[PDB]
């Protein structure tokens with residue numbers, strides 16, 4: 149049993165390691181080369197032990213072997229023992245606050261996933277070009293309305309993807325502060341009874357939204373969810389609400405982070421800014437690299453179903469494991485100069501969307517949201533730059549930017 153070095157075991161679980169970023173990257177360089185599958189054990193037992201998987205190859209094999217590496221038995225995100233208890237008191241014994249797609253395994257998982265799979269294809273999403281473009285123009289309206297200076301997060305990256313996800317879920321605009329509470333507080337990085345209450349309110353709320361989409365079906369994803377048939381029957385209100393909830397929470401901060409990372413890289417490299425300004429076909433490479441370079445979803449966990457080996461390391465039945473995508477996406481085995489923001493890297497070769505049977509349902513939509521936003525930005529600004537220091541959020545699960553002060557000149 150290889151052990152992670154003590155300092156690294158402390159760092160990998162610390163939200164501030166992700167805000168800081170660089171030192172953690174260095175610790176992954178040293179760890180991944182010596183022991184890409186290594187045990188993290190807390191000296192005073194504040195969390196259950198887990199295997200840190202730190203190489204691209206480890207995360208890739210772990211991700212693809214969904215029969216061996218399960219999402220349901222244990223919390224799907226790293227948590228300290230206290231958070232796990234809190235979750236179980238809130239739900240009456242499950243570690244999953246809400247139990248949605250990402251927390252399920254076969255046979256239930258693929259049945260529910262398959263429901264929206266067609267809707268999430270590029271083909272179908274291309275029908276939302278206009279609706280997204282309208283929300284991007286609204287985002288850039290706010291940017292330019294602020295003057296020649298302001299916080300890119302507050303103005304553009306934070307609200308925009310949430311507006312897009314409200315639009316595809318049929319959430320009315322006046323319910324925006326409820327959705328933000330949902331993605332910023334309920335999820336995001338006797339209080340048990342208020343969270344239990346709030347969960348139940350969201351479920352009742354989404355059950356009603358789904359009722360309306362059964363009466364008045366539309367082209368959006370809420371309609372697909374609401375009208376689903378599983379095993380000859382409709383989905384329960386719990387599952388139906390679970391589907392709305394995951395779409396919104398998987399869809400928001402993640403796309404905020406990569407949108408932000410893309411604007412950051414454009415702001416810091418004005419020669420690249422000018423080239424994509426003149427040739428928008430450069431945009432897909434930039435989008436893809438912003439997702440890799442930011443790695444908005446920083447880890448997911450798994451539980452081993454059975455005794456197995458990963459990278460020749462023995463893993464015992466019921467072992468908890470962290471698939472660390474930050475570590476995976478900065479592996480020099482796959483990425484030359486892993487640190488550099490490089491838009492010339494090829495598509496569909498990073499692990500920011502994971503791989504295997506849970507691979508991100510929304511990855512085409514995410515990419516599309518970013519491409520559209522950036523196209524709009526590029527038409528409407530002649531010049532962009534940083535006006536202060538970019539700050540990362542301190543969180544272990546979904547990361548991103550707290551603050552992104554910039555300065556620009558309106559085209």
Ligand code: HEM
Nearest residue numbers: 249250398399402403445501502503506507508509510514
């Ligand atoms: C840059 C933006 C995004 C990133 C980095 C990202 C990342 C991920 C990752 C790593 C997973 C788990 C994959 C695995 O376990 O192998 C996932 C799952 C998922 N994502 Fe995305 N995501 C993003 C955007 C979105 C968007 C915009 C939506 C929809 C609006 C979405 C919907 C989902 C859903 C429903 C799942 C669960 C899939 C399943 O369990 O089968 N995601 N995402």
